[PDB]
């Protein structure tokens, strides 16, 4: 407005700052939009918004560029020291931001005070530009590991049929033992070989099914299911490159989380997925 | 030669280009090399361009650096912000790049150089790629043969196991149903049999020492010979399809459809 | 009266120094802030303060940067090609740090600056080493809490399948060894009952459904309610040491020795 | 000797490198030592070329230090000149795989006016490397071998109750037979206490379903962590030279990727013996 400024952050790699200065090309006073890299120097900066003002006549008579400055809050866990012209912009953008101040010293323009303070995005603003599409990719692998609940389903619904036939058998054999053996026609010591002839007859069939594990094509995987969910529903390559995008983005907001200290617990983010 | 130059592509990360310059004091020509890194500022190039011409005179009086403008595609110039990912990719759709200099030129204003591409660009990439899924394809089969071998070996074995318990079942049921010797004359021959069968399947637990070692197992234990390890092998594949990602990420961006068949039908040929 | 100065360690990696200096056309004495990186080298730190401060007429030719030349401690000048982290490391044994500019505006001609020790550095570690003790401590005893818990209902149900199976073993004693029911008479019981107990397996399979499901698993079920899982678990242990070998790095070079209780000491009082 | 430098690789960081030039009046050449860091800018590197060696009486006023200049081999798969304010580390890499630069000084004394120095190999600068890794990587085995005797001295310990039940299952065995064969007593009176048996056996094997009781693996046991931690060596320091010993591979695979020569480690199995 008079002596405020915001440096804003555009969800490219860039900043934006707007500051208001006096310009004769306009009127009286804009708010301009400038905008930063943050491995620039500070002297480009300095030129930058030296560039688009009208010049300080010099009272020597030849010399006329402005000398503009930039001054931050050393905190002693007041006092105020100058930043040199050759920082780069980024290291300068996070020291200031834990200060959470800035101001500028343009020579001879101001009129009065000549302190233009600007204002750093806190570390909620900074993040809320990488929690959004750290949000979109979270929920999409949410929606991916729900399909592979339902082939779980599928899954479970084979299981569920052969051991409902195989619990039927057993029934059938225990009713069949019991009318061969209490109803007194057949005594048990003509019961008792056919018993042992068929234990091992199962013990036969538990070592065919003891040979039957082919397959484990594992990382968590199935066997059964890998052709299954794929070859007619939906892929794994494209599940493990959205973990692997999905994982770079969390150690960035934990580092910023770090410059900021910020707890940052994305249980608290838990409560943003629903309304 | 004169207003020409070139940018190459490192085998880092780096570029580097090649401008026709004119340095503090030379001739008029002098191909001097600059090394960037393409994710960075343009300032940071307009820096670097300017340290080593000779400066513009007064202006009354400035010993002032020249400003160099790097306008591209009819003469859109480009600000000092943009990164040179972005503008060695729009302008390497349009391949051609203008670095218009200042005060140094007298009058001549130009330097074109040209932008490398996708197949150049990427051709150093399936070299790399190119080398290391060769390196995939080989391990590959022969740990395939490990597999059939372990396979044979533990189903022959099994159906030796079958044969045997199989005759155990034949002369249990030709015993007991030709009533020679009865089943209370058969009772111990079962029980005992089968303690003694605890015994021939409990003394392999200490002598060869089996202590699971299932069918998959000795398949595990073989290519311990036979090949490597998984670590290995899934850092080969995982860092093939890191690769591949980023093939597909320049050749997307460039425009030019790609897929990676196209030089295995050169491996061999 | 300003040949003081301070270097302060940002909460980030790279840390700044400051000194006074005189940039263009000011009052002598001014503070003004530079950040370095504590892998670049010396000479990095040298062009930097040659960037801000008047050129020097030296008779033809006028250099236009100075020469500044960090000496150290009996004086030993060091070389213009050392590590900044070393330098400050011998020059931290030292607790002194001279920056001697050639040119001197008026009587004034040094600079001393005050390097900092391993108490403030390492409280910009000792705050992340305290937070991250402090939540390692309080999910491992409620986790711990969790695992006692898991383990009474398990013996509980353990205890009772045995109560009732040593209530078989009594009753097939006494039917048969000593009372009127024979043991041809109580085969079929035996028998019968084994497949009656198989049918409870099924049973157990199917409705309740378990398909291992050991004692374990009902821990490890069982504190995905009450906790948190491994991987997070096992990070913060493995970065809280990747922590303490680093301040066990640079307390190792400073020599002062230190064990991390010390401030667990702090902690509650 | 006159024509020739080489920069070769210390230890450290930084490097080093010789080249013979003209000084003060003590000798006509001396191969001289100047100590390079890789990110120091090139000008640095010519200036302190430009600082030892006597000047040149230039007129037009006086200029008198010389200006010297970089040379190397633009690949083709020529002589490009590089820039005065590079990093030294990428020229070192760029020009390391041209496996040769040329350094021009400004007087010429010297007929041809070049000095064609050296370019360090991939079996010098992998050769530190290599002595680093196979260091560490020796003072790992030998704890992974000691991990190996304390695993005999758990298997000792299995095989010692192993054998009591294989003799106890023995007495089983011929104490059926002689209670069943004889016929002193028949089948008829054995059968009821092998079902009993059968039952207390299956009892003494479900207590023993409860005793998977502590299991702490990351590969590591639990009734040895005590033993060979309590007793024997650690494995904090175990794991810390597997974090130390992890990060130095990838930086040979890294410069072993720029020099296109392959990294088998399998080659360098061969040098662990003579
Ligand atoms: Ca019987």
């Known amino acids: ?88 912009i980024g290291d300068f953008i996070r020291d200031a931001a834990r200060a959470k101040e800035f101001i500028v010293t343009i020579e001879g323009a101001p009129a009065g005070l000549e302190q233009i303070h600007v204002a750093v995005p806190s570390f909620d603003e900074r993040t809320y530009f990488l929690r959004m599409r750290l949000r979109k990719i979270s929920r999409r692998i949410q929606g991916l590991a729900e399909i592979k609940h339902e082939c779980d389903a599928l899954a479970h619904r084979g299981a569920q049929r052969v051991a409902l036939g195989g619990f039927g058998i057993l029934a059938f054999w225990w009713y069949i033992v019991y009318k061969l053996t ?67 983005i969390r150690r960035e907001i934990k580092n910023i989380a770090a410059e900021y200290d910020v707890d940052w617990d994305e249980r608290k983010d838990e409560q943003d997925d629903r309304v």
């Open 1 to 88: 407005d008079t002596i405020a400024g915001k440096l804003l952050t555009t969800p490219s790699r860039l900043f934006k700052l707007l500051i208001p200065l006096t310009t004769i090309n306009r009127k009286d006073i804009e708010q301009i939009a400038i905008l930063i890299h943050p491995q620039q120097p500070l002297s480009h900066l300095e030129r930058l918004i030296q560039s688009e003002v009208p010049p300080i006549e010099d009272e020597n008579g030849q010399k006329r560029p402005p000398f503009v400055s930039f001054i931050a809050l050393q905190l002693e866990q007041q006092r105020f020291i100058r930043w040199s012209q050759s920082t780069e």
């Open 182 to 248: 209490f109803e007194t026609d057949l005594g048990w010591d003509t019961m008792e070989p056919v018993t042992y002839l068929v234990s091992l007859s199962t013990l036969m069939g538990g070592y065919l099914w003891f040979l039957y594990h082919n397959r484990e094509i594992s990382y968590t995987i199935n066997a059964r299911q890998k052709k299954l969910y794929q070859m007619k529903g939906i892929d794994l390559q494209v599940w493990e490159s959205l973990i692997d995008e999905a994982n770079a």
